[PDB]
Amino acid sequence: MISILHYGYSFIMLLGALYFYLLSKDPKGVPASEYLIAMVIPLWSGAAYLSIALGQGLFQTTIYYARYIDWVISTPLLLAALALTAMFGGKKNLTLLFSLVALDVFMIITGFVADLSIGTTKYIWYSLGVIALIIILVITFGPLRRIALSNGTRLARHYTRVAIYLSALWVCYPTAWLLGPSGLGLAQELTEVLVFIILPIFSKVGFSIVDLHGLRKLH
Amino acid sequence: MISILHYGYSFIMLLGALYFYLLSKDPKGVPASEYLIAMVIPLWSGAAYLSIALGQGLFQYTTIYYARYIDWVISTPLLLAALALTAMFGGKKNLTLLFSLVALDVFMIITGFVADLSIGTTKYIWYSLGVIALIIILVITFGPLRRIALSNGTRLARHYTRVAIYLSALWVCYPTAWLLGPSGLGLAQELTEVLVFIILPIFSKVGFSIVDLHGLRKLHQS
Amino acid sequence: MISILHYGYSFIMLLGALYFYLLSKDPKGVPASEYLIAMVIPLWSGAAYLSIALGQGLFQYDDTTIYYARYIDWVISTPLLLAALALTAMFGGKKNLTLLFSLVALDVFMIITGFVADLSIGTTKYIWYSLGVIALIIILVITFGPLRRIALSNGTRLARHYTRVAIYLSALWVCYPTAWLLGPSGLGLAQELTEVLVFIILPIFSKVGFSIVDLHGLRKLH
Ligand SMILES: CCCCCCCC/C=C/CCCCCCCC(=O)O
Ligand SMILES: CCCCCCCC/C=C/CCCCCCCC(=O)O
Ligand code: NA
Ligand code: NA
Ligand code: NA
Secondary structure, rough: OOOHHHHHHHHHHHHHHHHHHHHOOOOOOHHHHHHHHHHHHHHHHHHHHHHHHOOOOOOOEOOHHHHHHHHHHHHHHHHHHHHHOOOOOOOOOOHHHHHHHHHHHHHHHHHHHHHHHHHHHHHHHHHHHHHHHHHHHHHHHHHHHHHHHOOHHHHHOOOHHHHHHHHHHHHHHHHHHHHHHOOOOOOOHHHHHHHHHHHHHHHEEEEEHHHHHHHOOOO | HHHHHHHHHHHHHHHHHHHHHHHHHOOOOOHHHHHHHHHHHHHHHHHHHHHHHHOOEEEOOOOOHHHHHHHHHHHHHHHHHHHHHHHHHOOOOOOOHHHHHHHHHHHHHHHHHHHHHOOOOHHHHHHHHHHHHHHHHHHHHOOOOHHHHHHHHHHHHHHHHHHHHHHHHHHHHHHHOOOOHOOOOOOOOOHHHHHHHHHHHHHHHHHHHHHHHHHHHHOOOO | OOHHHHHHHHHHHHHHHHHHHHHHHOOOOOOEEEEHHHHHHHHHHHHHHHHOOOOOOOEEEOOOOEEEHHHHHHHHHHHHHHHHHHHHOOOOOOOHHHHHHHHHHHHHHHHHHHHHHOOOOHHHHHHHHHHHHHHHHHHHHHHHHHHHHHHHOHHHHHHHHHHHHHHHHHHHOOOHHHHHHOOOOOOOOOOOOHHHHHHHHHHHHHHHHHHHHHHHHHHHOO
């Protein structure tokens, strides 16, 4: 079951990538950079999840290490997408964007180190990752939202919608991680696998459908 | 012999790097970034192949020359950056297209490494994903990236076309050698593969940048 | 004691990061990028040294302990430190990102040769070490030559600040390979505990000390 769920996920990622590629050819005022980011996220994730489907991107708790290889690239790119949405039609703040990238890469590395750790040490690393996530959300709903508001009512309305979308999904990851085999071990592996199949379909493909459709409608 | 071939390779990389350094001191309208990229590629490749010469950048698994992937994951995106910057010479940069090539290329090299670690059907899935990435890189090279070159005038576009064809002819030899040698079908012997992955990169790295830098320098006015 | 020294270091990195965050809130003409770099350096280093304090970021190898988390630290914190130095030289003028990325490439190479030297034994170790020292010498040539000439092109006052931080950085930087060679990774003349103390005290000055000196001096131009 675990193998065919990962093959299915990789196929959905490939269809999302092809959809974003088709949109890119009639871009309706959205810069090519947004289409490139929207394609890299699912292709990279698709490849990492294909490695799990093939029996390769895990070692035996089972550590699904290919998830961290995925997220360490896909998650900073998602925050770049969200930052570029806030900045659409205005000056870029690349400092703020790279602040999110740095927090996010740190967050994913702490999760990988937490997974390889035992006891108190595990929850130290996990806590540092959660703190990085809180700072990401403070930026999202604070200074980054203020840039979105500076770019007019329609853009700020779209940004708010994708900020809530992204944030609601993002808080689910560390919650599932803590409940599952990597943390307290209350949730079963098969549950956790389905959560880390379904959540990222929404976080990667769903998010960029919502984001690119909104930005395109501003044309 | 395999150790000595890697030492010789590393020495040629050093000479190439020092030659590009010397050109950089009299740049003839070529920006400093082209000289930097042309130096990093052979110095990085030189270090990676030195590790193979010393017996460190390889392991038994059949021998995996893993230091080749450490080499290519840096030197190959930089070579595509060089090609892209040639297409954009005298005109506006399209860094979105440049980074598209980087992303495709890093993915291609990683699928190679994973293919080398794999056995059976799995090996050929990773290899095929790498080949698809290469095909897209060549579609970009001869389609949108060439249209940028054509926008920068006749002489630049002629040079771009020479460099693009030179790169493409060498680049298709890599996955061809991979598939024929011990990592794939095991038709060619280890030594044969080693010599191909010594001689190809001398032309791909040092050769490419000699052609590219000389062609850009010739466009210089006074 | 080694564990407690690392906990104390991480705490000092966190206090430094918080000080730079507080300065960033009233920035006095210094761009946000300088404050971000000044925060990332100590947070990253603090995390890497936390892994040593917890007993994770080290292993036994040749009957000696490799503090591998130092190289994880330095491969990110050291290129950021050179970026901070380069941005100081360019303050009030056109950026030279080519020269900045030249220093980043040299620096990342230098740290990687150190890591490989640490994993090596005999002649091989000193080959890798020597390549990293060559990279450091080139970094220092850049720092006191072309990068200082950029600082001089941004006027007397900026160039005086640049020269101060260039000397500060360089004096600490030459200590690292010196300690490395004397200590258990090299000749084994200095004891493990001495090398641990050196690689605690030096980085407090290199990371937090450097950004205090750099940011105070830039803020005073306001
Ligand atoms: C945890 C990994 C650490 C990686 C560090 C990455 C971030 C630090 C680097 C600095 C980025 C600064 C960006 C400068 C852009 C200025 C232009 C602008 O603000 O629009
Ligand atoms: C050892 C690993 C090497 C990794 C770093 C490689 C860096 C090579 C890339 C070149 C960057 C070019 C900088 C862009 C130039 C813009 C114009 C300028 O301000 O000079
Ligand atoms: Na976006
Ligand atoms: Na070029
Ligand atoms: Na600075």
